Amino acid sequence: ASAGVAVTNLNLKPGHCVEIKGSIPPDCKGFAVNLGEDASNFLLHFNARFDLHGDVNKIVCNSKEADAWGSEQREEVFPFQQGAEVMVCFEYQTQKIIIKFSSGDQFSFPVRKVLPSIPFLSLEGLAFKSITTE
Amino acid sequence: ASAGVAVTNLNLKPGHCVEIKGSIPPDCKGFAVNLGEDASNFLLHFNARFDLHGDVNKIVCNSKEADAWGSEQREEVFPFQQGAEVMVCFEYQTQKIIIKFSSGDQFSFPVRKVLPSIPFLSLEGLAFKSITTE
Ligand SMILES: OC[C@H]1O[C@@H](S[C@@H]2O[C@H](CO)[C@H](O)[C@H](O)[C@H]2O)[C@H](O)[C@@H](O)[C@H]1O
Ligand SMILES: OC[C@H]1O[C@@H](S[C@@H]2O[C@H](CO)[C@H](O)[C@H](O)[C@H]2O)[C@H](O)[C@@H](O)[C@H]1O
């Protein structure tokens, strides 16, 4: 019940973070937060699947390069429920991106292409409330 | 040189608002916040001029359609300091856009074109910190 917001010139630099605060529709099959250069190049594609692509309550991360998906990293921790409010924070480190939830849960993804700064961010299926940088 | 963040798919419908928060450089001649359809069509171009084009500490507002600027509406209230943080909110109503300053100050600008929703937002010469919809 939505189409995601897109942000350009975010210019996220190593050692900094982006915190998204949003709301999950009560029939959301899954939602995604993409950090990259454009819709064909993602350093991180964070996908929380409620029931989608054969995944039920599972987090799938991956990168994309020239429209081609890399190898997925699945995560067991799934602190979400349809209709709730998400509060995610992404810290950019040259080696990895640390994802932290208000739940107290944390995990990282490895950086496969170091960027001097990250210019693009987009959301899907997530009704955005506020986006912040630090 | 120095523009900034551009948000697309903002989907601001009447009766809703967006609050921008950011940092003003210490040597800032002026900054802007744009709302509209794209880079050539602004329902509102909000330009706070510290010292620009003969306007010193003034606020100039205008609309733009197909790169052609419309009638400027100047304002004398200027609650901004260089090298400091700012926070502005824009409320969209089908007939006018209400602009409010952290200072309690407020004024409106007429909607010269009613859009079912407002798709685009961009900042120029203002360091982005956060954007919040309500
Ligand atoms: O990797 C993220 C993308 O995942 C696919 S669904 C993906 O499909 C492959 C087959 O190509 C395998 O079945 C995986 O098990 C499955 O996760 C999505 O369609 C994309 O939008 C990304 O989310
Ligand atoms: O209307 C806001 C835009 O104003 C121009 S500067 C503008 O120039 C016209 C003539 O071309 C008149 O002199 C106006 O008095 C003067 O303000 C800016 O370059 C744009 O960025 C908008 O701020």
Distance CA(A7)–CA(B15), nearest Å, equals 23
Quote the tokens at residue B26.
Answer: 């210490």
Residues of B in contact with A6 (CB under 8 A): 7-9
State this model's resolution in angstroms.
Answer: 2.0
Distance CA(A134)–CA(B12), nearest Å, equals 25
Burial (CB < 10 A; 0-12, 13-18, 19+), residue B17, is middle
Strand, helix or coil for residue B51: strand
Cβ distance B13 to B116 under 8 Å?
yes
A49 annotated binding-site participant: yes
State the CATH number of the domain containing residue B126.
2.60.120.200
Cβ distance B96 to B111 under 8 Å?
yes
Cβ distance B88 to B100 under 8 Å?
yes
Q: How many CB atoms neighbour CB B92 within 10 A?
A: 23
Contact B5 A10 (CB under 8 A): yes
Quote the tokens at residue B46.
Answer: 């909000």
Domain count, chain B: 1
Contact B5 A6 (CB under 8 A): no
Residues whose CB falls within 8 Å of the CB of residue B104, separated by 6 or more in sequence, listed in order: none
| Chain A residue whose CA is closest to B124 | A9
Looking at chain A, the number of H-run helices and the number of E-run strands are 0, 12
Residues whose CB falls within 8 Å of the CB of residue A54, separated by 6 or more in sequence, listed in order: none
Using the Cα atoms of residue A22, residue A25, residue A26 and residue A31 in order, give the sign of their dihedral: negative
Quote the tokens at residue B21.
Answer: 């928060």
Provide DSSP, A73-126: EEES-----TTSEEEEEEEE-SSEEEEEETTS-EEEEE-SS--SSEEEEEEES-
Cβ distance B52 to B125 under 8 Å?
no
Distance CA(B109)–CA(B64), nearest Å, equals 13
Which of A3, A129, A133 lies at the smallest CB-CB distance from B9?
A3
Distance CA(A112)–CA(A66), nearest Å, equals 13
Instruction: Please choose from A51, A72, A126 the residue to mutate so as to test ligand 1's pocket, defined by most ligand atoms within 8 A of CB.
Output: A72
Domain encompassing residue B123: 1-134
Which amino acid is it at A124? E
| Chain A residue whose CA is closest to B123 | A9
Instruction: Please choose from A34, A40, A69 the residue to mutate so as to test ligand 1's pocket, defined by most ligand atoms within 8 A of CB.
Output: A69
Query: Is A5 an 8 Å CB contact of chain B?
Result: yes
Distance CA(B123)–CA(B2), nearest Å, equals 10
Residues whose CB falls within 8 Å of the CB of residue A98, separated by 6 or more in sequence, listed in order: A90, A91, A106, A107, A108
Cβ distance A81 to A69 under 8 Å?
no
User: How far does B89 lie from chain A, in Å, by closest CA?
Assistant: 13
